[PDB]
Ligand binder design. Structure first.
Ligand code: HEM
Ligand code: HEM
Ligand code: HEM
Ligand code: HEM
Lengths: 52, 105, 49, 54, 425, 61, 446, 54, 54
């Protein structure tokens, strides 16, 4: 708990932050595409084709 | 030194007796859970202490199995419960904490 | 005497961008990894479908 | 043993209707189950350490 | 103009307790500090052989002011080094870092030498390193020969073994290391040498942290020369052999004569892939021997004794011929067959060689420390060159005379079927 | 075109395994739309008029 | 007080002067009674064709065995008698001849060097004697597993380019090389604009320049014109050479990616990362407490006998990576732990460890330039590879610049997702398959 | 040689049920681990004979 | 250390599918062993979804 609190760890977090952000994008777009989540997919231009 | 500090000491002697490892001839440090700091402290013990430790654990596991306890006179007295692991375990944690302070900068 | 050990000619198996001894392989490393990984990306895209 | 008895209390309440005494003591046993595991037993272990000077 | 700053002089100080302090402000980007101790292998006795080897390996173990982990990490953090270099007489703990970091490395240095803990478990964990350390050294056939040479020569102290005897590996105790430090790492047996450090600072730390008494006195039990021969059947393709007699103690006028004789006969090569035209021993052997061989004059000087002679590497069958050619070559110098230009060449080889030996701070520091311990003084290069010059041609002949007629010591390893005993030389 | 289309695709999107996965996921979405409908359009041509989607206007209300 | 930054300014400027024929004459004057003088020639094995691959090495064997002005024994006797040491070496890119001598013996030392460089009496009886000596050395070099693996590493990385060749040459070239073969190489390569007369010690620069006009003049009149030989770049190949030999006790592995070459500014940053990984040896005292993760895991788990990082530099190219010697069962773990370290540094390097790497380097650079022989070597080599002598203050300036962001960017440029050159020798059944090594060159997590 | 140790199948049975080092002092409270295995088998054997008719 | 080797579960997967020494020269005729495993899994997954309605 207290052992992971220091300058190196703040650097280590800063180093892996763009990566952990991009995996979130992979997870989200991945979930959105796999379920056909209409709420989000109504916004994207070519995927829009599902006229009720 | 104090009347109420003699009472904390008598409540501690009460708990010690209630814990009842002394009934199995064990010392307090015999009963510790074996983590990494602990494993190292056992490893760091001299020959005579390790051998005694082994026998005391052996004796208590034997009693545990046969569901017995030692005769009252042979119970480890609270006053003479030698905390043999203390300085070893304190040194191992000291060393760990340093490594951890170093791994921070 | 271990200095007789030359590596056999691989020009037969080499990608066209890796044919020249004069030319650095770095100038085509991106394009070559790019091609082989595009095959991988498209494979995954097709399997994901 | 409080946890075992408390679970036996929850067992008893499970097989009983939702009327007057049972609603209260039912949710009383329910909050106790979680307090006993999350807060109470981790506190006793800390005190027991202090008593052995550990 | 591309000229350097005018060079500062060495500052030397004998403390009233016996301790020596020497420093040179060379203005170098890095710094070098050595604690030289009269604690080499010769102060071991039969009950504690190899204790100074384990100690040599123990410089990184827990001290009172710094844990094992701290010494390693703290020194590496600043890119520093900590080295311990033993000889038969000396132990030298040399520390090295950039000049801004001296204070940290000094503290580590002082802890290692003056407050080691030799923890039971830490010492037990390190014992296997004696086997590794020895194995790596002993893979030079020369090492075991020069080890056997000393065991054959002396009955006493210099006979000691530098690497721990196998039977003592795993057997040297924490108490033995504690006893070794308590009675050898004392003020009167010590010298603190600094490079890229100011004298007031080195004098300060010596007066604060290096005032240690209650050890042993003189340069140990006077090393008694005996003579004899140690033989090692090896099956090692080539035969390594060393012939030696008692010479002179370091610092004496006679010692310098032996050093000139060493250069007359021939020490190391001078030209990369060379016939060694000026090497008296080499030419003498080559006349009679046509296979691969090597021969060099061996010169070892100690506080109370010395060993001079020659060392040979030859094919097993050629062994006797190489040793006999080499020995007879010395015999002609003893008989008086030595010219004045011959000695002059050797003199220039020794002079320039010495000067080259102290060119680097690594070589300069090791020399000042060894001087401080052996002599209690610092002798400038210009006056060492003066002492070399003082050697007469007769003194060189007499040094040869002394070798030819003195009780011999021999050590040889390989297929010894054609390697002669002392008897037969 | 000065560095290759593959060279600029590796530099921007295939270096990091993160953006490699992201390009596969984003590329899987856009491929599904172009394929499903594109293959359905091909299925229209080989079954011209035969399907209910072509007939539809015959029976209105 | 005198600080470290202040002390870098204190070291005198290397005085560079050019002769009329193209001979660069450079000196670093110090206070020492001794000195080191030498000639550094821009010639190696990269300059050699397949038919004359042993040439530079053969000339190196003949250079001290007699000149036209000093036949046979003469050179040896003259150098030996003044107490001087005479040395030479040849690498794939540079040949050097140097004398360790007293400063008052500098006139003679320069004179003798000129004789070796210009007037080498390549005697027919001697070149015949030398061929048996070099052949023996080849049999000698075979037993050095380390020398073999690095030769293999160059052979496989620089496949079918001049750089794939060893300095020594093959056995065929040693026994076939003629007297004419060596003079042709000497006339083509030992030319003034490719030579540096370097010196370090108790000498004035004016003394040295006088001697260079005194002994090296007579390489002009008319020169070059017809044959201008500039080095063509050498293609690096991601490849593997595996010499399985289960009769050898320990396995040797050398793994490297393509490095940028002498001139490139980011050699400094690569060297800092190479310091962070560092080197190990079973005789090191440090053990489990060593800073470097690879070194610490290797000691604890007895994963090798040694490892070392390297940044081998050539003109516009080089080899960057590690070499290790280990037990037959330990090759896989060793590869894993090393590759993981390259990758840690490529993606997630940290401020503290980078300062340590900077500090090791400052110490490495200063400890290396100790005494006349290392400094004279640094003068000769730097003038050939950088064109100037890069002052220690500038090296510090370029070291000080390297933060964690620099390390992971520069490491990524060279290490991340690249094809290594792999050289393996000895009991190498457990040595990873190339594809798996290639796979360890990237992280799926990143 | 003892085939309980060498044979690939029997090796597992030996290491799991025969030669496994077990504490001397384990309570009747350690019995339920084996009893759960009996119960899982019992449920499979009764469950199947029910499935033949269900 | 490589967790593929040390970890009790991953140890099996490594020894069976990853680090297993396999002959360099095995035919397409060696593929059916894996294909049978695919077929057994395929039959379990289609068979179950049929059993949900059968
Ligand atoms: C599918 C029903 C289960 C079976 C067949 C099973 C199997 C067993 C077996 C054979 C043992 C060794 C003998 C013994 O110590 O009892 C054991 C011990 C153990 N089981 Fe289970 N178990 C199951 C349920 C559980 C559950 C529900 C938990 C935890 C929520 C648990 C955690 C443990 C632990 C911690 C031990 C170690 C006890 C010790 O030796 O001190 N198991 N199990
Ligand atoms: C994890 C072990 C199992 C448990 C805990 C379990 C539990 C149960 C329970 C609670 C019932 C309802 C009791 C009743 O009203 O009679 C039941 C019935 C049933 N079980 Fe299982 N069972 C297990 C194994 C299986 C297996 C392996 C099969 C298939 C071979 C199976 C097939 C059946 C069938 C067909 C019934 C309905 C017949 C009946 O109610 O008696 N059971 N089981
Ligand atoms: C339940 C269907 C089966 C499965 C899932 C299965 C699984 C496999 C697998 C994975 C392999 C290794 C890969 C390969 O060599 O093909 C293999 C090899 C083998 N199987 Fe099967 N197998 C089955 C049916 C059979 C049958 C029916 C026989 C004999 C009547 C057989 C005997 C063998 C033999 C002898 C090999 C060794 C082949 C070799 O490596 O030379 N298996 N099996
Ligand atoms: C060893 C792998 C299996 C094989 C070789 C196998 C074979 C077969 C065959 C030949 C049929 C009749 C085909 C037909 O007329 O459509 C069938 C149908 C059936 N199987 Fe399996 N099967 C297997 C796995 C299973 C499993 C694991 C289940 C239970 C989860 C299962 C449940 C069914 C059911 C309910 C049917 C009847 C529905 C139907 O005919 O389509 N099968 N299977």
């Amino acid at each position: 708990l207290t052992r992971f609190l220091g300058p190196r760890y703040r650097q280590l977090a800063r180093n892996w932050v763009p990566t952990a952000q991009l995996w979130g994008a992979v997870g989200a777009v991945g979930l959105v595409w796999a379920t056909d989540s209409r709420l989000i997919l109504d916004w994207v231009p070519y995927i829009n084709g599902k006229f009720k | 030194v104090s009347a109420s500090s003699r009472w904390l000491e008598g409540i501690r002697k009460w708990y010690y007796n209630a814990a009842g490892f002394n009934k199995l001839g064990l010392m307090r440090d015999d009963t510790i859970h074996e983590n990494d700091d602990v494993k190292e402290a056992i490893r760091r013990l001299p020959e005579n202490l390790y051998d005694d430790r082994v026998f005391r654990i052996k004796r208590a596991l034997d009693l545990s199995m046969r569901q017995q306890i030692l005769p009252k006179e042979q119970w480890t007295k609270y006053e003479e419960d030698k905390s043999y692991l203390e300085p070893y375990l304190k040194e191992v944690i000291r060393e760990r904490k340093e490594r951890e302070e170093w791994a921070k900068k | 005497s271990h200095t007789d050990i030359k590596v056999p000619d691989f020009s037969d198996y080499r990608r066209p961008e890796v044919l020249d001894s004069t030319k650095s392989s770095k100038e085509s490393s991106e394009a070559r990894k790019g091609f082989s990984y595009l095959v991988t990306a498209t494979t995954t895209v097709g399997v994901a479908y | 043993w409080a946890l075992v008895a408390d679970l036996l209390t929850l067992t008893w309440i499970g097989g009983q209707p939702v009327e007057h005494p049972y609603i209260t003591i039912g949710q009383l046993a329910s909050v106790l189950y979680f307090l006993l595991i999350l807060v109470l037993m981790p506190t006793a272990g800390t005190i027991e350490n202090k008593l052995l000077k550990w | 103009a591309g000229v350097p700053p005018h060079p500062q002089d060495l500052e030397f100080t004998r403390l009233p307790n016996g301790l020596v302090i020497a420093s040179l402000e060379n203005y170098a980007p890095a710094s070098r500090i050595g604690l030289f101790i009269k604690a080499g292998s010769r102060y071991e006795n039969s009950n504690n052989l190899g204790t100074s080897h384990l100690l040599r390996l123990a410089s990184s173990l827990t001290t009172k002011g710094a844990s094992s982990f701290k010494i390693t990490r703290g020194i590496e953090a600043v890119g520093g080094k900590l080295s311990v270099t033993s000889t038969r007489e000396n132990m030298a703990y040399t520390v090295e870092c950039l000049r801004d970091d001296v204070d940290i490395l000094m503290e580590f240095l002082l802890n290692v030498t003056t407050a080691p803990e030799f923890r039971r478990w830490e010492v037990a964990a390190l014992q296997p390193q004696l086997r590794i350390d020895k194995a790596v050294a002993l893979q030079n056939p020369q090492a075991h020969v020069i080890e056997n040479l000393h065991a054959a020569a002396y009955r006493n102290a210099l006979a000691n073994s530098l690497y721990c005897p196998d039977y003592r590996i795993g057997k040297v105790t924490p108490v033995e290391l504690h006893d070794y430090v308590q009675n050898h790492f004392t003020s009167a047996r010590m010298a603190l040498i600094g490079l890229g450090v100011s004298h007031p600072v080195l004098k300060q730390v010596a007066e604060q942290f290096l005032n240690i008494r209650g050890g042993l006195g003189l340069s140990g039990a006077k090393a008694k020369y005996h003579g004899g021969e140690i033989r090692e059947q090896n099956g090692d393709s080539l035969v390594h052999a060393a012939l030696v007699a008692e010479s002179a103690a370091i610092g004496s006028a006679e010692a310098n004569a032996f050093s000139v004789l060493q250069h007359v006969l021939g020490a190391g090569p001078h030209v990369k892939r060379g016939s060694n035209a000026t090497s008296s021993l080499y030419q003498a052997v080559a006349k009679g021997v046509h296979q691969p061989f090597d021969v060099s004059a061996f010169n070892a000087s100690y506080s109370d004794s010395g060993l001079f002679g020659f060392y040979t590497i030859s094919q097993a069958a050629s062994a006797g011929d190489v040793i006999k050619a080499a020995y007879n070559q010395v015999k002609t110098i003893a008989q008086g067959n030595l010219s004045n230009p011959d000695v002059q060449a050797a003199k220039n080889k020794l002079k320039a060689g010495y000067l080259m030996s102290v060119e680097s701070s690594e070589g300069f520091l090791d020399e000042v420390g060894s001087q401080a311990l052996a002599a209690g003084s610092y002798t400038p290069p210009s006056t060492v060159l003066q002492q070399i010059d003082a050697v007469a041609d007769a003194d060189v002949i007499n040094a040869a005379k002394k070798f030819v007629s003195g009780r011999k010591s021999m050590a040889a390893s390989g297929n010894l079927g054609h390697t002669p005993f002392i008897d037969e030389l | 075109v000065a560095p290759t289309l593959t060279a600029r695709l590796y530099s921007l999107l295939f270096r990091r395994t993160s953006t490699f996965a992201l390009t596969i996921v984003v590329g899987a979405l856009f491929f599904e739309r172009a394929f499903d409908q594109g293959a359905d359009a091909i299925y229209e041509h080989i079954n011209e008029g035969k399907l209910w989607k072509h007939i539809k206007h015959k029976y209105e209300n | 007080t005198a600080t470290y930054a202040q002390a870098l300014q204190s070291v005198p400027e290397t005085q560079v002067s050019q002769l009329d024929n193209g001979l660069r004459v450079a000196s670093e004057q110090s206070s020492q009674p001794t000195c080191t003088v030498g000639v550094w020639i821009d010639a190696g094995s990269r300059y050699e064709s397949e038919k004359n691959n042993g040439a530079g090495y053969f000339v190196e064997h003949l250079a001290f065995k007699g000149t036209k002005n000093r036949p046979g024994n003469a050179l040896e006797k003259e150098v030996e008698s003044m107490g001087a040491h005479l040395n030479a070496y040849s690498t794939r890119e540079h040949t050097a001849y140097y004398i360790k001598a007293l400063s008052k013996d500098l006139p003679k030392a320069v004179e003798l060097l000129a004789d070796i460089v210009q007037n080498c009496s390549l005697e027919d009886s001697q070149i015949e004697k030398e061929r048996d000596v070099i052949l023996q050395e080849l049999q000698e070099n075979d037993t050095s597993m380390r020398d073999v693996v690095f030769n293999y590493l160059h052979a496989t990385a620089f496949q079918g380019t001049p750089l794939a060749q060893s300095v020594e040459g093959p056995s065929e070239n040693v026994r076939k090389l003629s007297r004419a073969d060596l003079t042709e190489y000497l006339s083509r390569h030992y030319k003034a604009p490719r030579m540096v007369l370097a010196a370090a010690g108790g000498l004035e620069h004016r003394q040295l320049l006088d001697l260079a006009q005194k002994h090296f003049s007579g390489l002009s009149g008319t020169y070059d014109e017809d044959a201008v030989p500039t080095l063509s770049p050498c293609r690096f190949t991601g490849s593997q050479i595996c010499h399985r030999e289960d009769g050898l006790p320990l396995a040797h592995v050398a793994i490297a990616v393509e490095g940028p070459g002498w001139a490139h500014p980011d050699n400094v940053a690569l060297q800092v990362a190479n310091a962070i990984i560092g080197h190990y040896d079973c005789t090191y005292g440090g053990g489990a407490h060593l800073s470097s993760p690879l070194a610490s895991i290797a000691a604890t788990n007895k994963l090798c006998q040694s490892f070392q990082t390297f940044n081998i530099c050539y003109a516009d190219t080089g080899l960057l990576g590690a070499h290790f010697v280990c037990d037959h069962m330990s090759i896989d773990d060793m590869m894993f732990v090393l590759q993981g370290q390259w990758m840690r540094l490529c993606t997630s390097a940290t401020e503290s460890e980078v300062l340590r790497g900077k500090n090791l380097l400052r110490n490495a650079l200063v400890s290396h330039l100790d005494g006349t022989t290392p400094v004279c070597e640094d003068i000769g080599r730097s003038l050939l590879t950088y064109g100037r002598r890069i002052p220690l203050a500038e090296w510090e300036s370029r070291i000080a610049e390297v933060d964690a962001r620099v390390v992971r960017e520069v490491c990524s440029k060279y290490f991340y997702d690249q094809c290594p050159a792999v050289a393996g020798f000895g009991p190498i059944e457990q040595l990873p398959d190339y594809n798996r090594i290639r796979s360890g060159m990237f992280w799926l997590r990143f | 040689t003892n085939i309980r140790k060498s044979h690939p199948l029997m090796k597992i049975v030996n290491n799991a049920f025969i030669d496994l080092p077990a504490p001397s002092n384990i309570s009747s409270w350690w019995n339920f681990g084996s009893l759960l295995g009996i119960c899982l088998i019992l449920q499979i054997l009764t469950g199947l004979f029910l499935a033949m008719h269900y």
